[PDB]
């Protein structure tokens with residue numbers, strides 16, 4: 318038997334799955350996850366796949382730093398994964414423009430408050446529920462010439478030249494971040 | 509899409525890409541600028557990965573850029589919510605929920621046992637002292 | 651114990667103090683009214699096998715009280731595979747001449763079943779190590795029983811996280827590391843034989859024995875403890891055996 322390698326975290330909006338190599342040949346796996354000073358918890362018991370969903374464990378405290386390790390079976394052989402701090406490195410999903418209303422010479426662009434895998438009480442928390450003030454949205458709008466706006470909520474209030482059509486695209490951002498600071502641009506919407 | 513002579517009409521995102529499937533070229537005639545056309549095209553032509561309905565057991569699929577995310581019901585987990593949380597009653601999993609000893613069984617659910625000086629309670633998982641000074645207990649704190 | 655605290659009187663009731671000729675020798679763990687688990691190396695230079703004393707309910711070595719019970723060691727059982735002066739198979743099972751009395755200050759630590767210890771207890775992060783050993787590397791011993799919470803490491807991690815040195819003993823399958831590599835907390839020589847106890851769902855279990863290490867709380871090194879789970883059957887079989895002439899007994903292992 319050989320130890321797993323290239324353990325990688327695949328996380329978006331807290332949906333967190335640990336992936337690894339190689340394709341098991343007469344070899345099964347069991348994953349363990351824990352926090353620095355917490356007990357080791359076993360997951361994906363004797364699985365033959367090379368992935369393990371750890372979402373339910375990390376959403377218990379997205380601010381903690383988790384370490385996982387993959388055991389290989391035909392102490393057992395294993396490999397540690399890199400440390401993972403959900404809050405600081407989970408990818409922001411592609412946003413979606415919810416709507417945009419025009420009053421006179423100003424347009425209100427609203428960004429959909431997307432839900433995350435973080436569960437609290439009996440529902441899923443939204444991206445703003447989790448990040449609060451750490452999250453901002455950036456608007457990339459053009460006439461028919463590049464223009465940009467930024468908001469600390471989910472709404473954009475911009476000026477527009479009457480009798481002219483504008484297209485929009487938004488992006489989620491967490492300024493304080495170092496890695497994965499921005500999501501991908503949302504689909505383009507034109508008025 | 510292109511019907512006979514419609515291309516005589518100026519470009520229209522609604523008529524061409526919303527009410528119909530528009531190609532890259534058609535989209536480019538609407539947006540004109542390459543940068544803007546590509547920004548539109550990456551999402552428009554990405555396709556909905558949730559179409560294959562991958563999320564099992566009553567989960568909800570959320571389409572993403574060249575992928576998807578599954579939101580599972582409480583008793584489920586896994587990339588596609590394929591993991592039954594209620595089907596992991598084995599010893600290596602949190603000691604099978606047993607307070608002390610756990611035994612796996614072939615043909616019968618796991619059973620819980622206790623160390624000498626303790627006996628298993630009616631719940632089938634807890635152990636209670638059967639002596640005044642059972643091992644592993646600190647009397648002045650009990 | 652380096653970087654620990656005083657174990658409040660009565661909160662480390664399975665701790666044993668072993669004396670030879672009335673002098674402090676090592677620590678130990680009571681697991682029965684008659685049996686004590688300690689370390690084999692504690693008996694490397696014993697000449698007077700009839701002068702071994704085990705004291706239970708001890709706390710402050712400078713004050714005597716009614717909770718302390720003393721017993722002569724009737725037998726010291728060591729694995730036939732242990733070699734004096736070395737580190738492997740560092741375990742000893744001692745039979746007391748007469749059973750101690752279980753009280754609020756004297757209680758045995760549970761000897762767990764092997765699989766429970768290997769699949770469950772081995773993954774509980776922290777465990778307590780205690781003794782009247784050195785308070786500092788090459789320092790003086792403690793008058794009051796000290797205790798310390800230390801995290802366990804799988805051997806692969808221990809080796810990877812430790813400073814490789816010349817004639818360093820190997821960390822075998824009969825051992826496990828626990829502690830810190832920043833030079834702040836660890837057990838020490840005088841704590842040898844003492845308990846490495848793990849708390850799990852309301853009950854404490856014997857998982858390790860203070861065995862060896864490079865100095866005490868040395869930067870780049872962890873304490874090494876005898877992996878008790880490997881000796882459960884060995885211990886159970888011997889406790890069900892009849893006494894044998896002569897204090898010292900070498901029992902085969904496995």
Ligand SMILES: N=C(N)c1ccc(CNC(=O)[C@H](CCC(N)=O)NC(=O)[C@@H](Cc2c[nH]c3ccccc23)NS(=O)(=O)CC(=O)O)cc1
Pocket residue numbers: 691694733734735736737815816817818819836837838839840841842860861862863864865866867872873874
């Ligand atoms: N930190 C701990 N938790 C810890 C440390 C020590 C003890 C007591 N055990 C010993 O001293 C044993 C006795 C062996 C015997 N049967 O007589 N020897 C040791 O540990 C020796 C092994 C050892 C020999 N050659 C080596 C070359 C490189 C590195 C190590 C060694 N290391 S040492 O000499 O540094 C112990 C000191 O003096 O403090 C208990 C807990």
Ligand SMILES: *[C@@H]1O[C@H](CO)[C@@H](O)[C@H](O)[C@H]1O
Pocket residue numbers: 556557558559560561562574575576
């Ligand atoms: C459902 O469709 C998605 C599209 O990406 C695919 O990944 C799944 O394997 C399929 O079940």
Ligand SMILES: *[C@@H]1O[C@@H](C)[C@@H](O)[C@@H](O)[C@@H]1O
Pocket residue numbers: 566567568569579580581
């Ligand atoms: C989508 O989310 C999942 C978890 C379930 O609550 C579904 O009923 C809902 O439509």
Ligand SMILES: [Ca+2]
Pocket residue numbers: 509510511514523524528
């Ligand atoms: Ca058309």
Ligand SMILES: [Ca+2]
Pocket residue numbers: 509510511514515524534
């Ligand atoms: Ca057309």
Ligand SMILES: [Ca+2]
Pocket residue numbers: 515518519520534537
């Ligand atoms: Ca056209």
Ligand SMILES: [Ca+2]
Pocket residue numbers: 522523526527
């Ligand atoms: Ca229309």
Ligand SMILES: [Ca+2]
Pocket residue numbers: 523527528
């Ligand atoms: Ca049409």
Ligand SMILES: [Ca+2]
Pocket residue numbers: 533537
């Ligand atoms: Ca054209």
Ligand SMILES: [Ca+2]
Pocket residue numbers: 515533534537
């Ligand atoms: Ca055309």
Ligand SMILES: [Ca+2]
Pocket residue numbers: 554555556557571572573574575
């Ligand atoms: Ca898509």
Ligand SMILES: [Ca+2]
Pocket residue numbers: 708709710711712713714715718
């Ligand atoms: Ca005393």
